[PDB]
Amino acid sequence: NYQPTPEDRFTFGLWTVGWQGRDPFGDATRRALDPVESVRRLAELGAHGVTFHDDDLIPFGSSDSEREEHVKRFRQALDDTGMKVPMATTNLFTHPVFKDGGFTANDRDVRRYALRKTIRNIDLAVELGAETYVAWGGREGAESGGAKDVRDALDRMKEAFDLLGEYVTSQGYDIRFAIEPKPNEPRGDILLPTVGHALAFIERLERPELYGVNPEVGHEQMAGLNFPHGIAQALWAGKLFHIDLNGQNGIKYDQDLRFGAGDLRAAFWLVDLLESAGYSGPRHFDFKPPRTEDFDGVWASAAGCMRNYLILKERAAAFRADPEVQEALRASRLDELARPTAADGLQALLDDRSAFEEFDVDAAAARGMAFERLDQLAMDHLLGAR
């Protein structure tokens, strides 16, 4: 049951199933995985495709010849299984040179290098068919207040993204950019910490239409925010270009648990929203099989990601299809929220005595919203207890 197939558009980063298990207080527990093995094993599990940071595919410091060898064998695995590469990104956080950031490093020479490293990988991403190029500025930020002048840093971040937009436009590439927010970790505070901050920043870019967000479940939850609400705002703005799915148990270090784990109810409301809105992008998992696991546990956790999406999809569909739920939505006036407040116009509203002078505030206040019955029907559907 709940068997994933390629048309579900489930994708995984090479760094996810390939995570060797090095955490903040521990050494690796698993050997490195060959990207070719990951492509084949994920295809066998029903995945649609894979994603990568430049340095996941090509060892940092590779010569052109070595680079070609690594890419060629990866492309052969893609050609053999029909696996796609819908998104790619740059590693601007592992190497010690990026200790104070890539695009917003205080050192100007580092900022220039970060852009050149990014541009090289945009070309490769385009060759492999990526539709979205993600940017996760994990080193952009500070541990102390005087270390980073944030207005200057935002000028530098805008400059970098504007140069990247000029580059893709000049080359005639159709690829678009997606900024992936995170509030903290590895930096004390990271710039553009939430979906909101990233959406706002994009509106200051020279070509805003080329940029959207790649929200990650766990990242918004690291700020204690409601992920489904943030995704609704990104959809409302026309900016949900991609999404990173995983689990997180509250406000703490970035867990990257398999999707479904962590906040289960939020996962249900997220899937309900993605399916009801008709999101058509990749269902990408950015997760880390816990370091307690061996390679069998790695594939069992990857399979669990997809399985939980599919179970939740079925429950959300059953919830929305239930006439008792549609009745409860009407009882809670969900449909009334879709009606314009004042399509009659400002003057009409001002002249409408029923909107103020003769408005029965006490009768309106006494009307229960019936949200608890609605939510218990949602709970019953999620648990299969109807």
Residue number of the CB atom closest to ligand KR: 135
**Judged by CB under 8 A, does residue 224 bind a second copy?**
yes
Q: Among residues 91, 88, 78, 62, which one has the least CA distance to residue 173?
A: 88
**Judged by CB under 8 A, does residue 73 bind a second copy?**
no
Q: How far is the CB of 293 from ligand KR (least distance, A)?
A: 31
Q: How far is the CB of 190 from Ca ion (least distance, A)?
A: 11
* Alpha-carbon distances of 183 from 63, 196, 271, 381, rounded to whole Å: 35, 11, 23, 33
**Judged by CB under 5 A, does residue 382 bind Cl ion?**
yes
Binding string, residues 159-188; x marks residues near ligand KR by CB under 6 A: -----x------------x-----------
**Judged by CB under 6 A, does residue 226 bind ligand KR?**
no
Helix axes 150-171, 108-127, angle to 10 degrees: 30
> Starting from the edge strand earliest in sequence, which strands make up the sheet with 211-213, in order?
211-213, 176-179, 132-135, 87-89, 49-53, 10-13, 283-285, 244-245
DSSP-based three-state secondary structure for 325? helix
Token digits of residue 131: 């539709």
Binding string, residues 238-277; x marks residues near Ca ion by CB under 5 A: ----------------x-x---------------------
Token digits of residue 84: 């796609």
Strands 176-179 and 244-245: unpaired
Count interface residues toward a second copy (CB under 8 A).
111
Sorted by sequence, the CB contacts under 8 Å of residue 343 that are 6+ apart come out as none
Part in contact with ligand KR (CB under 6 A); list of ranges 66-74, 194-202, 278-286, 305-313: 194-202
Q: How far is the CB of 233 from ligand KR (least distance, A)?
A: 5
Cα–Cα distance measured from residue 27 to residue 311, given in angstroms and rounded to the nearest whole number: 35
| Residue in this structure with the two tokens 């995985």, named with its chain if needed | 33
Burial grade of 32 (CB within 10 A; 0-12, 13-18, 19 or more)? exposed
Q: How far is the CB of 321 from ligand KR (least distance, A)?
A: 30
Nearer residue to Ca ion within complex by CB, 62 or 184: 184
Part in contact with ligand KR (CB under 6 A); list of ranges 30-38, 195-203, 261-269, 346-354: 195-203
**CA 244 to chain CA centroid, nearest Å:** 3
Sorted by sequence, the CB contacts under 8 Å of residue 189 that are 6+ apart come out as 141, 142, 143, 183
Residue 218 binding: pick among Ca ion, Mg ion, Cl ion, none (C-beta 5-8 Å cut-off by kind): Ca ion
* Residues with catalytic roles: 53, 56
Helix axes 323-331, 295-321, angle to 10 degrees: 70
DSSP-based three-state secondary structure for 206? coil
**Judged by CB under 6 A, does residue 98 bind ligand KR?**
no
For the annotated binding site for Mg(2+), the residues are 180, 216, 219, 244, 254, 256, 286
Residue 254 binding: pick among Ca ion, ligand KR, Cl ion, none (C-beta 5-8 Å cut-off by kind): Ca ion
Nearer residue to Mg ion within complex by CB, 193 or 325: 193
Answer for which of 11, 16, 51, 118 binds ligand KR (CB under 6 A) is 118
Residue 378 binding: pick among ligand KR, Mg ion, Cl ion, none (C-beta 5-8 Å cut-off by kind): Cl ion
Token digits of residue 335: 């449909």
| Residue in this structure with the two tokens 């009745």, named with its chain if needed | 327
**Judged by CB under 6 A, does residue 93 bind ligand KR?**
no
Answer for which of 18, 46, 218, 281 binds Ca ion (CB under 5 A) is 218
Residue 32 binding: pick among a second copy, Mg ion, Cl ion, none (C-beta 5-8 Å cut-off by kind): none
Q: How far is the CB of 270 from ligand KR (least distance, A)?
A: 18
Nearer residue to ligand KR within complex by CB, 164 or 306: 164
Residues that bind Mg ion (CB under 5 A): 216, 244, 286
